A paper describes a structure:
In bacterial cells, the related AddAB and RecBCD enzymes are helicase-nuclease complexes responsible for initiating homologous recombination from double-stranded DNA breaks (DSBs). For example, phage λ Gam is a potent inhibitor of the Escherichia coli RecBCD complex that helps to protect the phage DNA from degradation.
Previous work has shown that GamS inhibits RecBCD by competing with DNA binding. It reveals that the GamS protein does indeed act as a steric block to the binding of DNA. The interaction with the duplex DNA-binding ‘arm’ of the RecB subunit is extensive and overlaps completely with that of the duplex DNA binding site. It occupies a channel that normally accommodates the nascent 3’-ssDNA tail bound to the RecB helicase subunit, increasing the extent of the steric block. Although the structure of the RecBCD complex is closest to that of the initiation complex it responds to the binding of Gam by small changes in conformation. The 2B and C-terminal domains of the RecC subunit together with the 2B domain of RecB move as a unit away from the RecB helicase domains. The crystal structure of the GamS protein alone revealed a pattern of negative charges on the surface that mimicked a DNA duplex, suggesting that molecular mimicry might be involved in binding. Instead, the main component of the interaction is simply a steric block; the helix makes a snug fit in the channel involving many more contacts than the equivalent contacts with ssDNA.
Numbering used by the authors:
A (entry chain A): 41 to 138
B (entry chain C): 500 to 561
C (entry chain C): 812 to 1121
D (entry chain B): 5 to 289, 304 to 885
E (entry chain E): 61 to 135
The structure:
């Protein structure tokens, strides 16, 4: 004989919807730390060693960017994390699509 | 056999709901009676697919 | 409070494997090995009461209803038969939505199933069904394998990629490689999932088949615990295809434990493998000791799956 | 605001009383009830003495109305005896006897007031209108007899499917293509408007015209998109622009996506032109093309059929549900409150309000912070300005967490501004003085911390009886408030729930390990007592948090129970097994149905026993014989006697109590046997009884009588309870591990700061989203105030710099979005170092902070047993 | 001074054509398919999502500008 029974059932489903969205974001970050370890910066350094030398970029310039310069390695780790998190975003979305 | 909504098509319009022609006791019975005469593998006839489950003496309950 | 507590439900039972095992029996056994031992062995099957008839005409199709249409449509697309005939056939039965929503749902289904069909049609060749008679551990296996092309086994189902579908193709590929049948075996599923097993010699084919038949008589004796999904999820994280060896690292073991509980415990979107009538009767709550026993037994049978998969 | 003396309060017109948590506001109503009965207080007294049946008390909870009825019944009996004895041992009754002129006549009035307490009126809001509208029928225009409907969800989905049949099916395929994108069907359309259907219909910002149909809005936006489609076709193939380093030559891929999207019509989704539009191009940096700005015209206003379909559905479905209930004759709880509001708002409602003033020439409303726009307008239309009738409104604006139920704090804010009288009670009797100063200091950091000027925070003071309350753990006394701060910079919610539930469960077993040896004691003066698992309470916001603390606490071997669990009995495994039993007893001859029942966990038969049963057909025939005898008792008696004989013969009742955790299993079996006996008397058909059980197993009924009962001995087990169900209780030791967590409501719903009217916006414009998030934040602040005041001696709460921000940026933390984070940081976003410094600043002698460190030693000790 | 920054920017614009977005996709398709990233998911990021391409070409612009800056430092 509860008057608010209908409002109490809608509020109980609202929390289960919030933790289903939170569990989908945590699964996205779990695959984010894995794929980050799959593409270390030396893979992109090797990709630069190939195509950049024909345009006039010396091998020491690419070595000084990746190995020497710290800010480039910092921005690359943030870019790799953003690329992975976006790919993991679409991967989780495709997996979530029925 | 997809028997859900009201019994007839006239009953659907009596409730001011748009007339469909399916999911009714008349649609289901005709779907079940058509399956008794004709196998479901033949095809559609009135745009009602025959219901193959009872072709036999058990169709007397229909 | 002087009564005795309930003893563990699992008990060893004697069993003698006959000399003739139909292939349909092994296929139904390895689908749900825990469920098998209840029905196959002990003749115990819990009947789920028929679900309440929906009180309204379906607005959207879901569950087994849309799975049958996806299976009826996929078979018609690979044969290149007119899909509008099947559309008028389903709309005549009223199983689809009414009016335009029946057209919108049908075209977005025909758009997804056509992508899966174009991959099946490319490698498909006309073939005939063959019959199999084999001797493994002195046991005769009889059955039929439908649509065997000279290239190998070709199967297509409209569902998500699962280890239960890979195990189903695995037993079907081993029985194919044991009698002649030089060639591969392929299975196609929704969302690009694929199971492809390279050809093997009759030596190795009868070896892994002997391990599967030995698991059958083992399943008939005791309720062998193998979870195809959860046990496969723990095995996928640990096993590495490059080095062909499972990782003993503890950090990857804790991740595999989280992935194992993720496959066991289901969410609102997708129901989990852990919750079910057959698994609830054995244990009301899952203990770490039995979780290890499931891991060890799944590490045994389900290992050649990920080993030869490509 | 002024302090309140219960005997010095004049009762005339409208009076407002605010009572802080723990002030015993229920004790104040009894004092004013005895004051209204005897007509005491002189110039502040009611003009005439009154009868118990003429006093109206409104309390929203039914359980509180029965407790207040017995509380007043006992206070009338104590004062009556005190009048005959002329002396009393209590201060309140002593001050009452001082104001009493003639004690003999007053004792006769209390005797007549004691005999009438059976018809004494204490009602809920929904129990009031039901009795009032049935009192005078003609003014309300309602049938004399009406049956209350418990669940309106069935008629809501029925009417929602009726709207989706008439307003969708006839639509053409091109229009139906757009409706399918917003929602799949009426099931998803209902979930959107379901919060809007309950309660009073709010006001929509910028409502569409009443004559606009679906095809009108469809052809209008299609023409709006078709113009941009034509213009981009003709002007494609020319690149002239100011080149910036932000942009690059890869825009050609985005340009080609515009050419592919234009060629197809009926697609309501838009390809991304944002980079190509003029305002965003100005943000990146000018071509100044006419159709370049025409894209801005398209992107400025949102293109959807959503707002139109929802508006038509909200009005029509509400009419269909109300018409269907009027056909059946059933009335809902919300419909009765709308009936009295529609009755008083009618022209003939003026005579209706005159009979209420004569019936109850006074009113006292408990829990006034909980209220609706329908409720207040009813109390206002009656008691606002009347010469002889007063009004008493009691409630704490900081105590209203019920906005999910439809409670509006702005309704109280509108009510508070209209009443000139204000009275507050300054004596907090519930907790220790250390907790009073800790709560006052925490809310005194900022000014208007609750974010609403109309709700002030005022300091309270501990009484003289509680000044000796102390809590000792391992020698020297422990401070009243302890905040547990996690270590590290960024912390995820999953990592926050995990670690804190392990630290909280670790500190609970440490209180239990020191409680069994007598080291940890709850001390009042020189008296003390060990700390039982009973007084330890864990307060979580949701059910998913209760199970996460439950698994972490049970892993340490501390038995705990969820008091607020709403899970139905039919969801448990035994309820499904109860179906396989009654179905097998129905057909004992069937071999598959009988073997399925004996293989259930309730029968307790081992797999070896089932194997030996299949090997011998004679033993199977004997089981068929006993199951036939069970079917005979089933037919001659019922469900309950047969299950009693089945449990007695199989001895499963004793075997379940021997199995660990089996007593919880047995409590569900007996409760189902009670419900099956309830539904067994109504339906004589035995197969219809099995169909009734199977129907309830598929879909849980959720009814309160169908809710799982509490297990026995749980009084000695750690109590986990929700913040909402814990309001008004007493919890000596409280834990708030997850209090730092928060959720953001994406929908836009709010109340205007001026008109104080509920306003929903079907448009996503961020304005209404910001005003909606501010109301959620203020509600979370009130959720924290109640959870902090539940404690008596000590309370502990977890704090971590959790970050829900995308990418885990290191600039700032989102803790300011949380309720407790806004009060420590003064509403200013900071870093993890700033959060730690603000924690170390305010802690003196009461608040004390310790780092959160995970550790494990031993789960617990048995305490053995007694037999 | 002003010419050195112009030669560095001109050199970075020439390297931008040398490293297209599909060059990173080829490396992301080969290596990341082992970790469970489907071909459709990698294709959606490098093509469908616009915000990804905007930040992708922005960092590529940042990479070829920083490498060219070190190249002029070597010169």
């Amino acid at each position: 004989m509860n008057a608010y029974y209908i409002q109490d059932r809608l509020e109980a489903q609202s929390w289960a919807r919030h933790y289903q969205q939170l569990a989908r974001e945590e699964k996205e970050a779990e695959l984010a730390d894995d794929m980050e370890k799959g593409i270390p910066q030396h893979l992109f350094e090797s990709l630069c060693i190939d195509h950049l030398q024909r345009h006039g970029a010396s091998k020491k310039s690419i070595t000084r960017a990746f190995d020497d310069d710290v800010e480039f390695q910092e921005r690359m780790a943030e870019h790799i994390r953003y690329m992975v998190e976006t790919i993991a975003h679409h991967q989780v979305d495709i997996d979530s699509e029925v | 056999s997809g028997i859900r909504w009201g019994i007839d098509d006239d009953n659907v319009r009596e409730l001011e709901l748009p007339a469909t022609g399916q999911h009714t006791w008349r649609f289901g019975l005709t779907r079940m009676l058509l399956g008794y005469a004709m196998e479901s593998a033949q095809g559609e006839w009135q745009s009602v697919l025959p219901y193959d489950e009872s072709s036999g003496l058990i169709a007397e309950l229909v | 409070q002087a009564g005795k507590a309930h003893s563990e439900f699992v008990q060893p039972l004697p069993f003698t494997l006959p000399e003739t095992v139909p292939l349909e029996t092994l296929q139904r056994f390895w689908a749900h090995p825990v469920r098998a031992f209840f029905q196959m062995r002990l003749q115990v099957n819990f009947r789920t009461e028929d679900s309440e008839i929906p009180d309204t005409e379906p607005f959207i199709l879901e569950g087994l209803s849309r799975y049958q249409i996806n299976q009826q449509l996929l078979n018609a697309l690979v044969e290149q038969d007119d899909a509008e005939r099947l559309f008028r056939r389903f709309r005549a039965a009223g199983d689809l939505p009414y009016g335009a929503f029946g057209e919108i749902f049908w075209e977005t289904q025909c758009q997804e199933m056509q992508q899966l069909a174009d991959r099946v049609i490319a490698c498909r060749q006309p073939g005939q069904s063959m019959e199999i008679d084999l001797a493994c551990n002195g046991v005769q296996i009889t059955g039929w394998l439908p649509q065997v092309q000279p290239d190998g086994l070709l199967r297509w189902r409209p569902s998500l990629l699962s280890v239960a579908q890979g195990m189903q193709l695995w037993l079907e590929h081993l029985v194919y490689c044991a009698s002649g049948g030089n060639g591969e075996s392929r299975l196609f599923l929704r969302k690009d999932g694929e199971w492809r097993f390279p050809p093997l010699a009759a030596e190795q084919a009868l070896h892994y088949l002997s391990q599967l038949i030995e698991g059958y008589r083992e399943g008939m004796s005791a309720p062998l615990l193998v979870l195809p999904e959860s046990g496969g999820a723990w095995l996928k994280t640990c096993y590495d295809a490059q080095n062909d060896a499972m990782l003993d690292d503890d950090s990857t073991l804790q991740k595999a434990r989280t992935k194992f509980l993720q496959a066991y415990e289901g969410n609102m979107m997708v129901r989990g493998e852990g919750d079910d009538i057959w698994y609830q009767r054995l244990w009301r709550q899952l203990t770490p000791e039995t979780m290890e026993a499931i891991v060890e037994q799944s590490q045994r049978f389900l290992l050649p799956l990920f080993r030869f998969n490509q | 605001a002024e302090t309140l003396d219960p005997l010095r309060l004049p009762l005339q017109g409208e009076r407002l009383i605010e009572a802080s948590a723990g002030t015993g506001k229920t004790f104040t109503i009894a004092a004013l009830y005895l004051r209204l009965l005897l007509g005491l207080g002189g110039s502040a007294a009611f003009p005439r003495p009154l009868t118990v049946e003429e006093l109206l008390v409104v309390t929203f909870t039914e359980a509180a109305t029965a407790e207040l009825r017995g509380r007043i019944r006992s206070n009338i009996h104590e004062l009556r005896i005190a009048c005959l004895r002329e002396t009393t041992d209590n201060p309140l009754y002593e001050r009452l006897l001082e104001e009493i002129d003639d004690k003999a006549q007053a004792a006769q009035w209390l005797l007549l007031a004691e005999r009438q307490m059976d018809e004494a009126a204490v009602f809920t809001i929904h129990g009031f209108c039901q009795r009032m509208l049935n009192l005078n029928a003609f003014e309300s225009g309602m049938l004399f007899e009406q049956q209350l409907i418990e669940d309106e969800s069935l008629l809501r989905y029925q009417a929602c499917a009726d709207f989706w049949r008439r307003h969708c099916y006839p639509l053409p395929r091109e229009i139906a293509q757009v409706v399918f994108e917003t929602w799949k069907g009426p099931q998803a359309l209902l979930r959107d408007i379901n919060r809007y259907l309950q309660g009073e219909a709010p006001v929509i910002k910028a409502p569409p015209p009443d004559d606009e149909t679906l095809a009108s809005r469809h052809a209008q936006i299609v023409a709006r998109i078709d113009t941009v489609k034509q213009q981009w076709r003709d002007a494609v193939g020319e690149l002239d622009a100011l080149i910036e380093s932000s942009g690059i030559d890869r825009r050609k891929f985005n340009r080609s996506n515009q050419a592919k999207w234009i060629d197809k019509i009926s697609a309501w989704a838009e390809e991304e032109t944002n980079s190509y539009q003029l305002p965003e191009s100005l943000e990146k940096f000018t071509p100044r093309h006419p159709l370049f700005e025409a894209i801005d015209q398209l992107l400025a206003e949102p293109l959807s059929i959503r707002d139109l379909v929802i508006t038509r559905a909200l009005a029509e479905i509400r009419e269909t549900v109300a018409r269907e209930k009027r056909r059946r004759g059933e009335l809902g709880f919300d419909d009765m409150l709308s009936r009295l509001d529609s009755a008083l708002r009618s022209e003939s409602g003026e005579v209706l309000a005159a009979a209420i003033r004569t019936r109850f020439p006074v009113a006292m409303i408990d829990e006034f912070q909980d209220t609706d726009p329908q409720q207040y307008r009813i109390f206002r239309r009656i008691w606002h300005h009347q010469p002889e009738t007063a009004l008493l409104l009691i409630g704490d604006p900081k105590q209203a967490i019920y906005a999910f139920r439809g409670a509006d704090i702005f309704t109280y804010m509108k009510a508070r501004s209209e009443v000139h009288a204000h009275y507050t009670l300054d004596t907090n009797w519930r907790s220790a003085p250390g907790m009073v100063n800790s709560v006052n200091k925490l809310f005194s950091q900022t000014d208007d911390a609750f974010m609403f000027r109309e709700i002030p925070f005022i300091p309270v003071k501990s009484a003289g009886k509680n000044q000796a309350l102390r809590f000792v753990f391992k020698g020297e006394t422990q401070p009243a408030m302890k905040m547990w701060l996690m270590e590290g910079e960024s912390c995820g919610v999953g990592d926050y729930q995990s670690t804190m539930a392990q630290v909280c469960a670790a500190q609970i077993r440490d209180w239990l390990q020191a409680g069994q040896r007598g080291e940890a004691l709850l001390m009042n003066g020189d008296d003390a007592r060990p700390v039982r698992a009973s007084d330890i309470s864990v307060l979580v916001r949701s059910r998913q948090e209760a199970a996460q603390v439950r698994d972490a606490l049970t892993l340490l071997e501390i038995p705990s129970v969820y008091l607020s669990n709403r899970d139905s009995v039919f969801e448990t495994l035994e309820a499904q097994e109860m179906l396989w039993l009654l179905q097998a007893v129905m057909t004992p001859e069937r071999e598959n149905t009988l073997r399925s029942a004996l293989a259930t966990s309730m029968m307790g038969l081992n797999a070896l026993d089932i194997e030996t049963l299949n090997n011998d057909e004679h033993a199977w025939d004997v089981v068929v014989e006993e199951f036939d005898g069970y079917r005979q008792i089933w037919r001659k008696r019922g469900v309950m006697p047969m299950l009693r004989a089945l449990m007695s013969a199989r001895n499963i009742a004793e075997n379940l109590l021997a199995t660990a955790g089996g007593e919880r299993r047995l409590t569900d079996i007996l409760h189902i046997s009670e419900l099956l006996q309830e539904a067994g008397t109504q339906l004589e058909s035995e197969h219809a009884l099995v169909r009734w059980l199977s129907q309830h197993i598929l879909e849980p009924d959720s009814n309160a009588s169908s809710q799982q009962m509490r297990l026995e001995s749980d009084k000695h087990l750690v109590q986990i309870v929700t913040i909402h169900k814990s309001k008004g209780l007493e919890y000596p030791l409280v834990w708030l591990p997850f209090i730092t967590n928060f959720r953001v409501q994406e929908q836009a719903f709010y109340h205007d700061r001026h008109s104080f009217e509920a306003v929903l916006d079907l448009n996503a414009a961020p304005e209404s989203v910001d005003l909606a998030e501010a109301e959620r934040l203020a509600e979370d602040l009130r959720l924290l105030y109640v959870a902090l005041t539940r404690s008596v001696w000590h309370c502990s709460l977890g704090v971590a710099p959790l970050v829900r921000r995308r990418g885990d940026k290191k600039g700032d933390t989102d803790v300011h979005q949380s309720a407790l984070g806004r009060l420590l940081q003064k509403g200013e976003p900071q870093d993890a170092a700033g959060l730690r410094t603000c924690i170390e600043a305010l802690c003196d002698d009461d608040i004390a902070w310790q780092t959160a460190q995970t550790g494990d030693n031993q789960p617990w000790q048995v305490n053995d047993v007694s037999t």
